[PDB]
Enzyme design. Structure first.
Site, PDB file in Angstrom:
ATOM      1  N   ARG A  43       0.834  -1.185   0.000  1.00  0.00           N
ATOM      2  CA  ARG A  43       0.000   0.000   0.000  1.00  0.00           C
ATOM      3  C   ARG A  43       0.879   1.249   0.000  1.00  0.00           C
ATOM      4  NH1 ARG A  43      -4.005  -2.117   4.883  1.00  0.00           N
ATOM      5  NH2 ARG A  43      -5.271  -3.527   3.599  1.00  0.00           N
ATOM      6  N   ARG A 136     -10.589   4.171   3.328  1.00  0.00           N
ATOM      7  CA  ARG A 136      -9.192   3.809   3.113  1.00  0.00           C
ATOM      8  C   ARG A 136      -8.890   3.646   1.629  1.00  0.00           C
ATOM      9  NH1 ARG A 136      -7.191  -1.318   6.515  1.00  0.00           N
ATOM     10  NH2 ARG A 136      -7.826  -2.173   4.490  1.00  0.00           N
ATOM     11  N   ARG A 147     -13.622  -8.945   1.542  1.00  0.00           N
ATOM     12  CA  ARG A 147     -13.163  -8.528   2.863  1.00  0.00           C
ATOM     13  C   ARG A 147     -14.344  -8.240   3.779  1.00  0.00           C
ATOM     14  NH1 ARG A 147      -7.657  -7.002   4.275  1.00  0.00           N
ATOM     15  NH2 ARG A 147      -6.322  -7.205   2.425  1.00  0.00           N
TER      16      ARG A 147
END
Ligand SMILES: Nc1ncnc2c1ncn2[C@@H]1O[C@H](COP(=O)(O)OP(=O)(O)O)[C@@H](O)[C@H]1O
Ligand SMILES: Nc1nc2c(ncn2[C@@H]2O[C@H](COP(=O)(O)O)[C@@H](O)[C@H]2O)c(=O)[nH]1
Ligand code: ALF
Ligand SMILES: [K+]
Ligand SMILES: [Mg+2]
EC number: 2.7.4.8
Length: 193
Positions: A43, A136, A147
């Site tokens: 990330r 996010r 998820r």
């Protein structure tokens, strides 16, 4: 009798990483982070050797056969594992090892002899978890959905009797961080003796 490692888990996007970063910074001399291995891409703002050990799937699988991992499991199509050296590294600095694993990691760690404390960081509701995951924006639309799916399955399992020693509801970050400190008071006191 004395200090023991800390296993912190919970659904993705529930605030586990942020709570640990504040805990690690404010208590550098007590807690050391366990650097897991992952096969997912980094990330933005992520550093190799700190957040994870960013490796390819071939490298990760070669380590599994070599027996370098105390535990390992797949999550969202990417591999994750806690290496034996990651736990030993923190032990070599006289620090309490803090681990961030998924539900499968917790069950795997239940087999090991580390005997850690189990803390589940939970969101107030599933919908709030979706908003925090969407804010996010580090996951694709398909990866976010699965998820989310794994979140509810881990959400229900969070109420399993004897699985999690302490459950933290991550509504207010300050409130959740205060609850994290309170549940870690025995570990911090034991380490400081
Ligand atoms: N108390 C809180 N209130 C609102 N949002 C929060 C709170 N705690 C964490 N978050 C959100 O969670 C996101 C980070 O989650 P993270 O800790 O990376 O998930 P994971 O638990 O999978 O590590 C941040 O973008 C932040 O907006
Ligand atoms: N079993 C296992 N799960 C992990 C490990 N490291 C991270 N995880 C979990 O895998 C997921 C990956 O989330 P990410 O780090 O990509 O945001 C999270 O649920 C995290 O807690 C690990 O070493 N072993
Ligand atoms: F630990 Al995450 F999304 F940040 F599972
Ligand atoms: K980790
Ligand atoms: Mg994380």
């Amino acid at each position: 009798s004395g200090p023991r490692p800390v296993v912190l888990s919970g659904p993705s996007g529930a605030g586990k990483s942020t709570l640990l970063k504040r805990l690690l910074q404010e208590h550098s001399g007590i807690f050391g982070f366990s650097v897991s291995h992952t096969t997912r891409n980094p990330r933005p703002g992520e550093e190799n050797g700190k957040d994870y050990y960013f490796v390819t799937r071939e490298v990760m699988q070669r380590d599994i056969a070599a027996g370098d991992f105390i535990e390992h499991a797949e999550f969202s199509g990417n591999l994750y594992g806690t290496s034996k050296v990651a736990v030993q590294a923190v032990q070599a600095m006289n620090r309490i090892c803090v681990l961030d694993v998924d539900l499968q990691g917790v069950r795997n760690i239940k087999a090991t002899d580390l005997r850690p404390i189990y803390i589940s960081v939970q969101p107030p509701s599933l919908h709030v978890l979706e908003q925090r995951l969407r804010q996010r924006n580090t996951e694709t639309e398909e990866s976010l959905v699965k998820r989310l799916a794994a979140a509810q399955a881990d959400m229900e399992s969070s109420k399993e009797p004897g699985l999690f020693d302490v459950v933290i509801i991550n509504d207010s970050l300050d409130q959740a961080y205060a609850e994290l400190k309170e549940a870690l008071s025995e570990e911090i006191k034991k380490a400081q003796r």
